[PDB]
Every structure is written in structure tokens, then in C-alpha cells.
Design a binder for these strands. Structure first.
Ligand code: HPA
Ligand code: HPA
Lengths: 338, 338
DNA sequence: TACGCAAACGTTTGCGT
DNA sequence: TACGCAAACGTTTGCGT
């Protein structure tokens, strides 16, 4: 159809191209005519044709775990924002932690020839790790690892451990010694790593966490609900709880209130993520803020660089979690004695 | 590079193609050899090339308003799910209710030659309505209108009005007569239309809503926060409130609790949307459920049909909101007298 | 029987003059 | 000076035989 514009304007398609892309000087008169035709014919230059010659789709693929969850959604929206402002197209794909599902999206992606790949798979087993390598040719970066699990990628690291540690400390310095915890899946960084940072602070204080007091969550509110219950549903209960994710926390707040417990009057609660509306939780959730925006932007940028600047060597960039004091924590029994 | 496989297998690329796409019979021996080469060479057939000949990207574009908001996120995730199971690729784009931003994504989209277009722009002013028509050639459907604003599209309609009406009725039959309302933007369907359905029920009951009792929201929790405040922050206050969206409601729950008010003991609250975790609100939010999944799937399907079955004529499909009784509403003063 | 030739899809771009 | 020719990018597919 570019052919059709060239004719209507009586110029070569080469010309047409040049004016459309300002790739070389053209007579105004000529330039005009082209736009003229361009408009009447109602022209929309074909990207795929172009992509075919230039060799780049100017589109990036996001191999995500899921997009509904608050945590994720925010990250994603960050990424999309950046793509748009730098003219890239976002192809979103959720594998739900499913090998097949990943092998598929991964394949489709390579095929649609995405210029780069953003990865957020939560769990990374060897098998997944392998498929990924089969694509070391597509520039890509993973945004959810603790350390650098691999050499053929870029990685932005959250310091989830330093965060877990912050949370514990807070509780400690608040007067708490009987603390419980609902961690996220141990196969994730935000799971394992947050718990570890937490357990360090505990040990550093000679606080021991009774196993009856640590209940696995899955980041989903319901899991928070059940955990909380299980904890305060026992003879001896902690006076403070550290919840691996704000959304699970939201679920833990529900149960307490449902058992007639008072937060924080009866139970102090500290979360992790600092989701967009954790502030409007009841009560306003005190939590650890993960820089989701900076995490998105920072990944998109490494990707660009590798893309444009054709970087070959891996790179990792750390980001930093920080404490947000809201209203779900109260002084503990030992505040005064310190 | 298909050329490179044909050579390694000593067959024509035509052959190579045929085996890759099972488009015609091939000797096993031959078939094998092709796969053989296909693998060693580590082949990934180029989609863009293919798309270029066949004339279809097998990818759909989602021109959304925003993807962070719960309501939206869920819808989106629904759409994505369907795309994947029918082999389509999802290109996600947020215009944030910005004409330019829309004209851009719209353009990029046409250019990347998306097979179809899914639209969720919230507000549709004439200008936006016009740009859209410039693309009546791309098969597309809008998922957020009340009625059929246009002839060149398909439309799934939510019956938000029948929903608004349901909510009012509930409150009424619960014993309430002094009700307030925090509606969503009047320029949206889920805004205006929900309010209307509500106001009908009121009129049908000779209940009059004092203007001091209706405060505009923007679907964002903060707006809920402020509204609630403004309402219960006055001499004479309603005994029940109808909130246009669960997330705003979440914001209204926060304020009440912050003013030391009890929900529902002091104020009964009814929301709208039935977001994934409205159940884990405190208290568990009684609300109107919008079938988000069915809304996504139902749109993707109309789109497919128009796509594959090459349908030319518009079509609209209604979906139905329904009441979910949770724990934020209590009997009102007039329950017994009815 | 089972396969191959060559044109075409819509662009960009190296040389020209 | 300001522009045009033709090849190429990686596929599918109508005819062949
Ligand atoms: O994997 C996750 N899922 C949901 N919320 C989260 N917050 C941190 N990590 C996660
Ligand atoms: O436009 C909207 N935004 C957020 N939540 C909503 N729920 C219904 N409509 C909307």
C-alpha cells in the first residue's frame, strides 16, 4: 500500500518512505504531496514489513507469573509506563508457574521476535532455568531473584532479606519478644529471603520462634486468613506477627477481627510490600515498602541498554526496601526495659 | 534461516515449511530430517515473516484505561487467559483517559497490525469516539459501555443500572430510609449508570437523597476515604451508604473506623464490583458482583467471531450483576415496619 | 508419489545520477 | 540538487511434474 501512496503522489515509494521517516531531505512540495496521499488513502505503514527489514519489533515481552495480584499489577503498570514513553510495545504473558505454559509463551515470544524479555516467574527450578538459557540470545532481565542465579541475564535485586531483618528489628524495639510469622512460598525470593532476614534479627536477639508460630502463606489473602487463625487459635499465642505480604496481611487482619481480636491492641501486625492501598487497610497497615516503580523502571532500562547499546555482559542492580510506620503495631511488653 | 534448515536437511524450504506447519504430506524420513536440522540449528520460525504473507498477527490489542486497579486487573487477567488458550498474543496499553495517549496506542496498534481490538477507556467523548471510527477496519469490541454508543463495534453490556437498583432495594428492605451515596465518575457507565439504577429504587420508595449526602468518588480508595468523612462529618448523617466501587468502599471503611464509627453497627455499607478480596475487607464487604471473568471471555469471543467468521454487523451481549450478602449491612430502623 | 520453483507479502536502503 | 532502481528481509503457496 506504500506503493499506492507513491502513485497517488507520483513519486517513488523510496521517496514516500524517506518523508515518512525523515530519513533524508525531501522537497516540501514533495513532502506535502506524500502526506496528502498518506492521508486520503488513510495510510498506516505496516510495522511487520518494516520490522522484517530493520530487524527489530520495538516490542518487549513480559513473562509474568500472574497479573491480578496487587504486588504484580503495580510492577507491571510501571513497566508498561516506561515502554510507552520510549515507544516500545508491551506483550504480557502469565505462565502461572507452569513449565509448559512458560515453554509456550517463551516460544511464542521468540517467534513474535520480541526485542527483549522481562522475567517474573517467582519460582525458578532447573528446568525453567534451562529453557531460559535456550534463549540467551534474546536480551532479557529477571526482576525477581535474590542474587544472580545465572550468568546469561541481567538482574535487579530487592534486598528482601535486609527487609525481613528490618521488620523483625522494628517489632523487637517495640517491646515484642513473642512473635509469629506467616511467610510466603519458600521457593521464592520474597518468600525465603524475607523470612531469613527476619529470623536473623530474631537470633540476634535470642528470640526463638516456636514452630507452632510460623505458618506458610501463598501471598493470597485467604492464606493469611487461615494462618492468623491457626496462630491465635492456640493456647499460647504471640503478641506480634510478621506477615510476608500486605495482601496476606489483609487476610490476617480479617481473621483477627473475626475472632474478636483487636489489632493492634490484641495483636500487632507488620506486613511487607506496601501495596498501593495498604494504607487504607483497617487499621492502616504498618509495613515494609518495596520500590515497585523503581523496580520496573530499573529493569526496563537495563533491558534497553543491552538492547540498544548491545551489552553482552551481565549486570545486577540493587534496590532498597524501607520501613513505613502506619497503625497496626503497638508497643510490646518489653518496651520500657531497654 | 528457514533456508538454512532446508540446506542442512537437503530439501526445499517449501518442504521445510510443509512439515513445520503440517500443511501437506511428507515422507517420515524427510519429516525427521527437517526436525533434526530444525533442532540443531536451533530454529525459531519468524512470526513477522509469516504474518507478512498470511496477513494476520494472531495478536490482539487491549486499549485499557489503567491496569493497576483491582477491577481492571481482574478483567485483564481474564482476557489474557482466553488469548493464550486460543493462541493469541496480548498487547496491553494504558491511555489513562488521555486523547493523545489513545491516538498513540491506537496508531501503534494498527501499525503492529493487531488482528482485533479490545476497548476499555472508561470515558468516551466525541473526539475519542471519532478516532475509534477511523479504525472501524480493525475488528474491535468495547467492554465498558452502558448501551451501544456506536454502530461500528461490538459491545458487551453490564446492566450496571439494574445493579444500582439492586443495591438500593437491599438497603431499603433492610430498614433503611436515610441513605447516602458515593458514586463513581458520572462520565462512565459504572459511574452514572450505577447511580441511576440506585436513584430509581429511591424514588420508587419516596426516599429523597439530600445533596449533602451524595459525594463523587473516582474509584480510588482515597476518594472513598474523603467522601465517607464528608458524610459522617455532618450534623445529620445517613444510616446507610451505597459506595459505587469496592475499592472506594475500602476507603470508606477506613475513615469510619478512623472517626471511631462502627460498620455496620453505626453505618451500614454496600459496595459494588465484588473484587477478588472484598471478602477479606473488615468487615467482609456486602456488595454487588460484576461478572468480570464472563465479561472478559464474552468480549474475546465476540472479537474472535468477527475475526475468524468475518462478521460485519454489530452485536451486543448483556451480562448480569448480582447481590452478594457479606457482613457490612445491618437491619435499619424500619425493618420491622413492612 | 512425494516434492520443488518461483512469485509474492510491504517495507528499507545502497548506489546511482 | 533532489530523487529513483532494484535487491533484500523470511516466509507461504499456486502450479508444476
Ligand atoms: O510473588 C509474590 N506474589 C504476591 N505478592 C508478592 N509480594 C512479594 N512477592 C510476591
Ligand atoms: O472505571 C472503573 N475503575 C475502577 N473500578 C471500577 N469498577 C467499575 N468501574 C470501575
Amino acid at each position: 500500500t506504500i506503493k499506492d501512496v507513491a502513485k497517488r503522489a507520483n513519486v517513488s515509494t523510496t521517496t514516500v518512505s524517506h518523508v515518512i521517516n525523515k530519513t533524508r531531505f525531501v522537497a516540501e512540495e514533495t513532502r506535502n504531496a506524500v502526506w496528502a496521499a498518506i492521508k486520503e488513502l488513510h495510510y498506516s505503514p505496516s510495522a511487520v514489513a518494516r520490522s522484517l527489514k530493520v530487524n527489530h519489533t520495538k516490542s518487549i515481552g513480559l513473562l509474568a507469573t500472574s497479573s491480578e495480584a496487587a504486588y504484580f499489577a503495580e510492577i507491571i503498570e510501571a513497566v508498561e509506563k516506561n515502554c510507552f514513553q520510549k515507544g516500545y510495545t508491551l506483550i504480557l504473558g502469565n505462565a502461572w508457574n507452569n513449565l509448559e505454559k512458560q515453554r509456550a509463551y517463551l516460544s511464542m515470544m521468540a517467534q513474535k521476535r520480541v526485542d527483549g524479555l522481562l522475567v517474573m516467574c517467582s519460582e525458578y527450578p532447573e528446568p525453567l532455568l534451562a529453557m531460559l538459557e535456550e534463549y540467551r540470545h534474546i536480551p532479557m532481565v529477571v526482576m525477581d531473584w535474590g542474587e544472580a542465579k545465572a550468568d546469561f541475564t541481567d538482574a535487579v535485586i530487592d534486598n528482601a532479606f535486609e527487609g525481613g531483618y528490618m521488620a523483625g528489628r522494628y517489632l523487637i524495639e517495640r517491646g515484642h519478644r513473642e512473635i509469629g510469622v506467616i511467610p510466603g512460598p519458600l521457593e521464592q525470593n520474597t518468600g525465603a529471603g524475607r523470612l531469613a532476614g527476619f529470623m536473623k534479627a530474631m537470633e540476634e536477639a535470642m528470640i526463638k520462634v516456636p514452630e507452632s508460630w510460623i505458618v506458610q502463606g501463598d501471598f493470597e489473602p485467604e492464606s493469611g486468613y487461615r494462618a492468623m487463625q491457626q496462630i491465635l487459635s492456640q493456647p499460647h499465642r504471640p503478641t506480634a506477627v510478621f506477615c510476608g505480604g500486605d495482601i496476606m496481611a489483609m487476610g490476617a487482619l480479617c481473621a483477627a477481627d473475626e475472632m474478636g481480636l483487636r489489632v493492634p491492641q490484641d495483636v500487632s501486625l507488620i506486613g511487607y510490600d506496601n501495596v498501593r492501598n495498604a494504607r487504607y487497610f483497617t487499621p492502616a497497615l504498618t509495613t515494609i515498602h518495596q520500590p515497585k516503580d523503581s523496580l520496573g523502571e530499573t529493569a526496563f532500562n537495563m533491558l534497553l541498554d543491552r538492547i540498544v547499546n548491545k551489552r553482552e555482559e551481565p549486570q545486577s542492580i540493587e534496590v532498597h526496601p524501607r520501613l513505613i510506620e502506619r497503625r497496626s503495631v503497638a508497643d510490646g511488653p518489653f518496651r520500657d526495659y531497654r
